Amino acid sequence: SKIALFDQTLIASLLQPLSLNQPDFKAYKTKVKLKISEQRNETSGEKELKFEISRSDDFEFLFSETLNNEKYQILARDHDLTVDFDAFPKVIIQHLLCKNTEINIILDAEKNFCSFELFSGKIFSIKLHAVRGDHLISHLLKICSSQAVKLSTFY
Amino acid sequence: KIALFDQTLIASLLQPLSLNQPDFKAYKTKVKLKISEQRNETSGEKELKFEISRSDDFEFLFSETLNNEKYQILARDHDLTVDFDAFPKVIIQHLLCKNTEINIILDAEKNFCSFELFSGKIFSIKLHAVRGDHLISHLLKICSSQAVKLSTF
């Protein structure tokens, strides 16, 4: 079973490099929908935590990352997070629901990855990968279907 | 990639209903056929892509791309005397004819479908289920075109 712990649209400053041997960047604030869900791994009952970001203005924009205890222990040490893996979603959801929080998404040069941060790299940083294949096919199919609903209601 | 055909045809869609019995749920529908002339990315060899899509079904996507080698098997089966280069000229003409019967026989698992003229006899290509990046783009076109429609309204 996969339980959603967060599903709100946040304001994020979206940074992306554009050149080699020149510091040109594509910077702009945007509405990024963040989805934090709790799941258990199908192979071992081990608790997981999936992070997923999507843009409503960019259908192709899909980046996710799923944490396990092992994966989180590397993260915690790096950003000097004192909390354990179970009490960490409680901490971040609270940190996120705060209007004063700065969500900066630093995108990959080839938009293959994205560093989702809080305030700056040093404060907090998850590296989400590019979602493709069947997981993007479904996400794209949800949009088409939800927009098919919107155009039907349109009278 | 040069498009040689891009019209919406009326096709009788035969959907299977049984296993070990040829019972079908038949209904006419609007199937957009696109025949394009391309060249293989590995070797400059000329290729001919057949692609069917439904406007009423976003997931409905089937393609099949012919090369000379692949066409030589097809030509023998349907006793087509024509060469690979002179064959698109022949089918486009066959298709533009109002009298032609376009029947698409669907796969029980919706993985393939035999696109045929009248029955299999004249012309019958077996198209596979289009997935991956080719469906991603096709789905991205719909989202984008529907994003335009919802902006205007």
UniProtKB/Swiss-Prot annotation, chain A:
It is found in: Cytoplasm; Cytoplasm, Cytoskeleton, Microtubule organizing center, Centrosome, Centriole. It comes from the Eukaryota. Residues 44-96 form the PISA domain. Disruption phenotype: RNAi-mediated knockdown results in failed centrosome duplication in embryos. Central scaffolding component of the centrioles ensuring their 9-fold symmetry. Required for centrosome biogenesis and duplication. The coiled coil domain is necessary and sufficient for interaction with sas-5. The 35 nM long coiled-coil domain mediates homodimerization while the globular N-terminus links the dimers at an angle of 40 degrees to form the inner ring. Nine homodimers form a cartwheel structure with an internal diameter of 23 nM and radial spokes connecting to the microtubule triplets. Interacts with sas-5. This is Spindle assembly abnormal protein 6. The gene is sas-6. The chain holds residues 3 to 191 of 492 of the full protein.
